[PDB]
């Protein structure tokens, strides 16, 4: 039984897409199939951001952010709860979960 | 490529008929197409049609009366003898009460009943009912 | 669609219904046919000759002005090419591809395109031989074809 | 006895009206009637002789002097060459890569022939016959055949 119309990946009008290595297990996964997650977050967590403020030498020093792009294989994405199973019709929904 | 203009025309009429359209554009046009359409007109299965001259193969616009059940072509154009005509009727027509088999005979393009009357066999073109 | 490509393009010329010559054309049939002779003698292919006439002289269709197709006009005057232009241009392309392969023998794509080009040459030459346009024994000799074209 | 060709090169003598004939290791590509130039101000061409100091980094050379003025000791066998890696203008030294893979520091006044030694690929051919080996060493020295010590 076919489960997904796009076969679980974003490859439509090409033959081969270069693989990439999973962030957790380093498994080879096609770039179009990898569950991607561009993580932007402050270098200092919200708990410690206050301490760094009065520890700083600058009057108004904005905390730099951390930009990490994660690529996940299907097993690691499911295991790490990045994605979950969905129902027959819930699978077809493509909009990202609300902020 | 297009191997049979008549097949393309009859299929195009059949699809528009099923879709409830009132007019269908037929391209390209041929004497065999026009003679076939005339046979359907004389029996009321289609309305008036206007061949359109483009200094090319031609285009036709047929008025559909919502009466055709199916206008299908037979490929290849098998030779049909008078004795074998009955076995063709039992295979191509829903009943003998209605429906016609269009034959191209030496006498001219005609339906199967006119061919039987004129005692001429020929090559089968198509059918409609 | 294309015989040697997956393309199904429709781009082409749509010839107008009216075949008559317009009133604004002052060029007579003979005058147009003499202008054809200058261009062909200048070394232009029938295809090209039609463009110069259409672009700068208002001659939409030489056939409409003169009653004869350009190549047919050139045949009467004896200016017709020895090799048909379409066949000539396919041979010219094959020579250029074959020149590239001698110095780029890792170009497996150029090897693939060449087989296609030579396939069209043979299909074209088979047609010309049938209508008796090429001698009954004209063969494309990839080795000796470079001298024919350019 | 040598797998590399030699070139008879004739130079004018600077001090006497007389021609001087020099026997060179033939850099691959040189031909009879070609002019070859030797000096500090010679141009970077195959067969020219230049000090390694004036050569740019990555130059491929052959018949390279091991010491300044020794008239050529390095990379002389057929198909071998040396590479100029780097220079030290302060110490007048140049680093080269020898055919063995060893890197050697030599004076920048060491001369060399630009290019590789002709006759390369000689060892690619299987000798096949003991007789061909016999003729090979008959021109070199009495070192063949070899009896096993055991």
């Amino acid at each position: 039984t076919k489960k997904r119309r796009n076969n679980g990946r974003a490859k439509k009008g090409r033959g081969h897409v270069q693989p990439i290595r999973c962030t957790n297990c380093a498994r080879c996964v096609p770039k179009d199939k990898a569950i991607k997650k561009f993580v932007i977050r402050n270098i200092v967590e919200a708990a410690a951001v206050r301490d760094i403020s009065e520890a700083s030498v600058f009057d108004a020093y904005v905390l730099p952010k951390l930009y990490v792009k994660l690529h996940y294989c299907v097993s690691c994405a499911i295991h790490s709860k990045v994605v979950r199973n969905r129902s027959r019709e819930a699978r077809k929904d493509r909009t990202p979960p609300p902020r | 490529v297009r191997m049979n203009v008549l097949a393309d025309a009859l299929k195009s009429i059949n699809n528009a008929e099923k879709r409830g359209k009132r007019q269908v554009l037929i391209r390209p046009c041929s004497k065999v197409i026009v003679r076939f359409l005339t046979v359907m007109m004389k029996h009321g299965y289609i309305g008036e049609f206007e061949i359109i001259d483009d200094h090319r193969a031609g285009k036709i616009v047929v008025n559909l009366t919502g009466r055709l059940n199916k206008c299908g072509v037979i490929s290849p154009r098998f030779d049909v003898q008078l004795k074998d005509l009955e076995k063709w009727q039992n295979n191509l027509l829903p009943s003998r009460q209605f429906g016609f088999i269009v034959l191209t005979t030496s006498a001219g393009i005609m339906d199967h009943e006119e061919a039987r009357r004129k005692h001429t066999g020929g090559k089968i073109l198509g059918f409609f009912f | 669609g294309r015989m040697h490509a997956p393309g199904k393009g429709l781009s082409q010329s749509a010839l107008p219904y009216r075949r008559s010559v317009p009133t604004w054309l002052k060029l007579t049939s003979d005058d147009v046919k003499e202008q054809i002779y200058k261009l062909a003698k200048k070394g232009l292919t029938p295809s090209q000759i039609g463009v110069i006439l259409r672009d700068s002289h208002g001659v939409a269709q030489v056939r409409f002005v003169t009653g004869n197709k350009i190549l047919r006009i050139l045949k009467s005057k004896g200016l017709a090419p020895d090799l048909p232009e379409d066949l000539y241009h396919l041979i010219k392309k094959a020579v250029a591809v074959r020149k590239h392969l001698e110095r780029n023998r890792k170009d497996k794509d150029a090897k693939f395109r060449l087989i296609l080009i030579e396939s069209r040459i043979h299909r074209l030459a088979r047609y010309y031989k049938t209508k008796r346009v090429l001698p009954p024994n004209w063969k494309y000799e990839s080795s000796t074809a470079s001298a024919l074209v350019a | 006895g040598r797998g590399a060709p030699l070139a008879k090169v004739v130079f004018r003598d600077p001090y006497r009206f007389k021609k001087r004939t020099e026997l060179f290791i033939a850099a691959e590509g040189i031909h009879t009637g070609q002019f070859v130039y030797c000096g500090k101000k010679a141009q970077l061409n195959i067969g020219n002789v230049l000090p390694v100091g004036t050569m740019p980094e990555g130059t491929i050379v052959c018949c390279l002097e091991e010491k300044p003025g020794d008239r050529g000791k390095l990379a002389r066998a057929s198909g071998n060459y040396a590479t100029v890696i780097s220079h030290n203008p302060e110490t007048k030294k140049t680093r080269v890569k020898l055919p063995s893979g060893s890197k050697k520091v030599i004076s920048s006044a060491n001369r060399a022939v630009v290019g590789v030694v002709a006759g390369g690929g000689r060892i690619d051919k299987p000798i096949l016959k003991a007789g061909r080996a016999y003729h090979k060493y008959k021109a070199k020295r009495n070192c063949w055949p070899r009896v096993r010590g055991v």
Partner: protein, 91 residues
Amino acid sequence: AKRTKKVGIVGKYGTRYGASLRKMVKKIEISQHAKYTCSFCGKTKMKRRAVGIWHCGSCMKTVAGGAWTYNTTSAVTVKSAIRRLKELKDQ
């Protein structure tokens, strides 16, 4: 008519030496004895005189080349590289 199926030029070695050694030497055996097109005069009369020496019987030009071919891939690569480096020393 075709006289040999595959051995070709190394059919002179008979059944001796081993198929692999005969196959390996075949390519060298062909290119060593081939006549190449002289670049100086255009005639196909450049043939090997000695190992690494090539001579044209028409323009009487002698060229230092490869052991078994007129020029080796190493030589043509070096000549291109030397030509570039010459431009770098210049403008």
